[PDB]
Amino acid sequence: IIIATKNGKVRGMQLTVFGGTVTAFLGIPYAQPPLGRLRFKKPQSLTKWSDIWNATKYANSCCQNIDQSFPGFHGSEMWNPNTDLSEDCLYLNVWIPAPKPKNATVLIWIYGGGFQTGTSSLHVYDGKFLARVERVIVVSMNYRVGALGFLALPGNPEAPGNMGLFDQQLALQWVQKNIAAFGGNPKSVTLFGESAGAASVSLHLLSPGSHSLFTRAILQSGSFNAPWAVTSLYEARNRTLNLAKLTGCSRENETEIIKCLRNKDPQEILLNEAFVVPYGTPLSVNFGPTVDGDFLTDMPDILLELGQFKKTQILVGVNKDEGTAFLVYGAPGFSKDNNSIITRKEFQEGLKIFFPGVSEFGKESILFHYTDWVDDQRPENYREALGDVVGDYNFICPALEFTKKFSEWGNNAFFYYFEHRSSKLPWPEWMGVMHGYEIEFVFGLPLERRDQYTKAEEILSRSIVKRWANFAKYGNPQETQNQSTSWPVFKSTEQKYLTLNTESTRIMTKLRAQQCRFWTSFFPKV
Ligand SMILES: *[C@@H]1O[C@H](CO[C@@H]2O[C@@H](C)[C@@H](O)[C@@H](O)[C@@H]2O)[C@@H](O[C@@H]2O[C@H](CO)[C@@H](O)[C@H](O)[C@H]2NC(C)=O)[C@H](O)[C@H]1NC(C)=O
Ligand SMILES: *[C@@H]1O[C@H](CO[C@@H]2O[C@@H](C)[C@@H](O)[C@@H](O)[C@@H]2O)[C@@H](O)[C@H](O)[C@H]1NC(C)=O
Ligand SMILES: *[C@@H]1O[C@H](CO[C@@H]2O[C@@H](C)[C@@H](O)[C@@H](O)[C@@H]2O)[C@@H](O)[C@H](O)[C@H]1NC(C)=O
Ligand SMILES: CN(CCc1c[nH]c2ccccc12)CCC1CCCCCC1
Ligand SMILES: CC(=O)N[C@H]1[C@H]([C@H](O)[C@H](O)CO)O[C@@](O)(C(=O)O)C[C@@H]1O
Ligand SMILES: *[C@@H]1O[C@H](CO)[C@@H](O)[C@H](O)[C@H]1NC(C)=O
Ligand SMILES: *[C@@H]1O[C@H](CO)[C@@H](O)[C@H](O)[C@H]1NC(C)=O
Ligand SMILES: *[C@@H]1O[C@H](CO)[C@@H](O)[C@H](O)[C@H]1NC(C)=O
């Protein structure tokens, strides 16, 4: 199977999925490799080729530091890259139904990873099941991460910032120009992503250069207003200059600093990335999105508040235990290999780990609001409070606030609370419904019965896949055939949301109301 694109012919490959066929095009380039003098610059358009490009294997993943905290442990290593790292990584993937559809809705995945890690080739992002089951086209792209994707000397085109977001954008542009050749509908494109990918999707809603490149948006466990998602111009410059000092590249002319960093091996860049901040946390985003005056024309909180974003439907949600995964990356007393019953003193020390630049009063105010116990004698009280602190502050309250503010300008929004812990989850049970572990359900891995998920998880994934596909196709995440709970729109008054679990799917109101009033109204003042 050969498809003529606007830059040349590409060859795909046939997959057998659930007794049917999916055509996969893996590793289509969508930009000039950003190498040599193109490192740190915006992605450049692609010169045509005359041969047949063989898109039959996942391409290189972008340079990035690896999670080496639990060698040999699938719970962490399933997120590490599974193809060679290379600066030559600006490639994308396309899964199309077989037989070739006529005007199929398109789903574009943007992976997360704190804007420092990630790759589209991960097993849990395999789009062949979505294409097979729902006859949508799935596209995913690699984009630059870390300093190579987000280094910023604001205003300087040698390193303007937001390059990895512009990589994402050029890929959406590729889908606009080429996807009809694959049987896709460029007028029916839904972006979806998780964590930093979700924050990325939310910034595409704010960026005027992305408004004509997609229809709708899905935001899984993330949004730009999360406290880790946007770097200020002060810190971005301080971090670029710290990286220059760490590499021997300090110069007076800012452009000569970039030229010096262009001659450094990617490994020297990657090795010094962690130290550009003084106080890291397990959630540090050393190099990430900034207000560059190009992709982002103003501080995104201002754009959100004043209604300056794409008017369309959104689907947004969070997981029950967003915060727990980060506790075993530094909080004292915590371990994935025991039950992590921590004391009050260990709790207080954990706040210092997760809020290092925050005043004593600010840390006490966290302790005061989260340690008013239903039972003082419950031994896991402090262990659970710290997970909820990290989860509510970093993910759940920003997602709820994004959805509130977004829906106030008249658009339909749908909010979910994912509370199913995967039966295959390799992390311990005290970490619950972890950050990142709805993705496999969204992508339909539990539909593969050979893979030891329960039957109840097959059913849950099947229903989630249908709702996601109906949202992309029709702007409405219902499952209309199997007497399913109707998913109501989220309004800023009543704030209804839908719970996703294997027992009973429920309509609830005002998620984490007391906790989020603390984080959204009081804590930003400290
Ligand atoms: C749970 O484990 C943590 C982590 O300790 C490590 O992992 C264990 C599973 C075991 O292999 C230990 O030998 C390892 O050191 C424990 O936290 C440590 O506690 C000791 C004494 O309390 C202290 O000296 C260390 O600094 C702690 N490690 C930290 C803070 O990272 C914790 O006590 C264990 N909790 C339970 C309930 O078993
Ligand atoms: C591109 O691929 C052509 C055909 O490859 C066919 O499919 C792959 C997956 C292998 O199974 C191969 O044995 C098949 O014949 C090649 O003929 C051609 O040389 C390739 N082009 C380049 C530039 O590598
Ligand atoms: C800004 O930068 C100052 C210098 O940072 C120091 O040197 C670099 C190379 C790193 O190793 C870093 O860890 C060092 O602390 C800092 O002193 C300062 O705190 C930074 N931040 C702010 C807000 O000023
Ligand atoms: C050390 N961890 C760095 C990643 C990171 C840095 N900064 C962020 C900001 C938001 C979300 C994630 C990050 C990796 C955390 C992952 C989380 C996914 C589930 C279990 C595996 C462990
Ligand atoms: C150090 C270590 O590997 N410990 C134990 C692991 C992990 O604690 C969990 O899988 C969560 O990471 O779990 C086991 O009990 C299990 O699941 O059979 C085996 C093993 O003794
Ligand atoms: C695909 O659908 C759009 C409307 O969503 C329509 O304008 C376009 O002509 C269609 N293309 C086909 C059917 O090839
Ligand atoms: C910095 O170097 C660049 C590269 O030649 C040059 O164009 C620019 O004018 C220099 N800036 C200053 C202030 O000298
Ligand atoms: C609806 O129910 C049938 C069984 O009656 C099941 O096979 C099918 O997968 C369900 N569809 C969805 C979209 O959940």
Q: Is the CB of 427 under 6 A from ligand 5?
A: yes
Residues making up the chain, counted from first to last: 526
Q: Hey, what are 301's tokens?
A: 């909180």
CB-based contact 99:88 (threshold 8 Å)? no
Q: Is the CB of 329 under 6 A from ligand 4?
A: yes
Q: Is the CB of 428 under 6 A from ligand 5?
A: yes
For residue 459, give the ligand nearest its CA. 8
For residue 156, give the ligand nearest its CA. 7
Is beta strand 91-97 parallel, antiparallel or unpaired with respect to 20-29?
Answer: antiparallel
CA of 110 to the centre of ligand 1 (A): 37
For residue 337, give the ligand nearest its CA. 5
Where do the domains of the chain lie? 1-526
**Backbone gaps in the chain, preceding residues (C–N over 2.5 A):** none
Is residue 163 helix, strand or coil? helix
Of ligand 3's listed atoms, the one at least distance from the Cα of 277 is 13
- What is the Cα–Cα distance from 242 to 277, expressed in whole angstroms? 8
How far from 39 is each of 200, 247, 300, 339, CA to CA, in Å? Answer: 21, 16, 26, 45
Q: Vertex 465, ends 464 and 470: CA angle to 5°?
A: 100
- Give the other-Cβ count within 10 Å of 197's Cβ: 28
**Nearest residue (CA) to ligand 6, atom 14:** 103
Instruction: Note the resolution in Å, 1 decimal.
Output: 2.2
- What is the 3 state secondary structure string of 294-354? CCCCCCHHHHHHCCCCCCCCEEEEEECECCHHHHHHCCCCCCCCCCCCCCHHHHHHHHHHH
Q: Is the CB of 253 under 6 A from ligand 7?
A: yes
156-172 core/surface letters (b: 16 or more CB in 10 A; e: else): eebbbbbbbbbbbbbbb
Q: Is 79 within any annotated ligand binding site?
A: yes
CB-based contact 195:172 (threshold 8 Å)? no
CB-based contact 286:277 (threshold 8 Å)? yes
Q: Is 112 within any annotated ligand binding site?
A: no
Q: Which residues contact 456 (CB under 8 A, 6 or more apart)?
A: 502
* Beta strand segments in 434-503, E: 496-500
Of ligand 4's listed atoms, the one at least distance from the Cα of 394 is 10
Q: Hey, what are 485's tokens?
A: 């709970």
Q: Is 113 within any annotated ligand binding site?
A: yes
Q: Hey, what are 381's tokens?
A: 């009280």
As beta bridge partners, residue 219 has 193, 316
Q: Is 114 within any annotated ligand binding site?
A: yes
The catalytic residue positions are 195, 322, 435
232-250 core/surface letters (b: 16 or more CB in 10 A; e: else): ebebbbebbbbbbebbebe
How far from 453 is each of 42, 148, 318, 332, 434, CA to CA, in Å? Answer: 42, 38, 22, 33, 17
Q: Which residues contact 501 (CB under 8 A, 6 or more apart)?
A: 418, 419, 420, 460
Of ligand 8's listed atoms, the one at least distance from the Cα of 481 is 1
- What is the Cα–Cα distance from 473 to 215, expressed in whole angstroms? 10
Place of tokens 């199913």: 420
Pocket of ligand 1 (CB under 6 A): 332-333, 335, 337-339, 341
CA dihedral 249, 255, 256, 262 (to 10 degrees): 60
